[PDB]
Amino acid sequence: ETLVRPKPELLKLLKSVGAQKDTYTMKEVLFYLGQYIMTKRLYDEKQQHIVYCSNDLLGDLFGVPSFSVKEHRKIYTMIYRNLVV
Amino acid sequence: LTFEQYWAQLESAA
């Protein structure tokens, strides 16, 4: 129940999968981000923890062409670099 | 799918 405020690019990402608010729980931020990635089918078929985000708004937010969903800290770090504070 | 269960893991930290 800590609410965070996505900076504009993160917000745009959330809004492309139906997000309506200015603020969000982290669980919400991940929810939408998870949906975007399933939706756009960005995960690797065989190795489904691999996400290819080069050439995508998600790539702009993250600053990498790919990442593993096992790199928990890395992912939360990207998000937390993209919050109004 | 496998991606949903790696991602579900991710949500436990939040």
Curated annotation (Swiss-Prot), chain A:
Phosphorylated at multiple sites near the RING domain by ATM upon DNA damage; this promotes its ubiquitination and degradation, preventing p53/TP53 degradation. Induction: By DNA damage. It is found in: Nucleus, Nucleoplasm; Cytoplasm; Nucleus, Nucleolus; Nucleus. Residues 1-77 are annotated as: Sufficient to promote the mitochondrial pathway of apoptosis. Residues 2-85 form the SWIB/MDM2 domain. Ubiquitous. Isoform Mdm2-A, isoform Mdm2-B, isoform Mdm2-C, isoform Mdm2-D, isoform Mdm2-E, isoform Mdm2-F and isoform Mdm2-G are observed in a range of cancers but absent in normal tissues. Residues 1-85 are annotated as: Necessary for interaction with USP2. Region I is sufficient for binding p53 and inhibiting its G1 arrest and apoptosis functions. It also binds p73 and E2F1. Region II contains most of a central acidic region required for interaction with ribosomal protein L5 and a putative C4-type zinc finger. The RING finger domain which coordinates two molecules of zinc interacts specifically with RNA whether or not zinc is present and mediates the heterooligomerization with MDM4. It is also essential for its ubiquitin ligase E3 activity toward p53 and itself. MDM2 RING finger mutations that failed to ubiquitinate p53 in vitro did not target p53 for degradation when expressed in cells. E3 ubiquitin-protein ligase that mediates ubiquitination of p53/TP53, leading to its degradation by the proteasome. Inhibits p53/TP53- and p73/TP73-mediated cell cycle arrest and apoptosis by binding its transcriptional activation domain. Also acts as a ubiquitin ligase E3 toward itself and ARRB1. Permits the nuclear export of p53/TP53. Promotes proteasome-dependent ubiquitin-independent degradation of retinoblastoma RB1 protein. Inhibits DAXX-mediated apoptosis by inducing its ubiquitination and degradation. Component of the TRIM28/KAP1-MDM2-p53/TP53 complex involved in stabilizing p53/TP53. Belongs to the MDM2/MDM4 family. It is linked to Seems to be amplified in certain tumors (including soft tissue sarcomas, osteosarcomas and gliomas). A higher frequency of splice variants lacking p53 binding domain sequences was found in late-stage and high-grade ovarian and bladder carcinomas. Four of the splice variants show loss of p53 binding. Lessel-Kubisch syndrome: An autosomal recessive progeroid syndrome characterized by short stature, pinched facial features, prematurely gray hair, scleroderma-like skin changes, small kidneys and consecutive kidney failure, followed by severe arterial hypertension. Interacts with p53/TP53, TP73/p73, RBL5 and RP11. Binds specifically to RNA. Can interact with RB1, E1A-associated protein EP300 and the E2F1 transcription factor. Forms a ternary complex with p53/TP53 and WWOX. Interacts with CDKN2AIP, RFWD3, USP7, PYHIN1, and RBBP6. Interacts with ARRB1 and ARRB2. Interacts with PSMA3. Found in a trimeric complex with MDM2, MDM4 and USP2. Interacts with USP2 (via N-terminus and C-terminus). Interacts with MDM4. Part of a complex with MDM2, DAXX, RASSF1 and USP7. Part of a complex with DAXX, MDM2 and USP7. Interacts directly with DAXX and USP7. (Microbial infection) Interacts with herpes virus 8 protein v-IRF4. This is E3 ubiquitin-protein ligase Mdm2. The gene is MDM2. The chain holds residues 25 to 109 of 491 of the full protein.
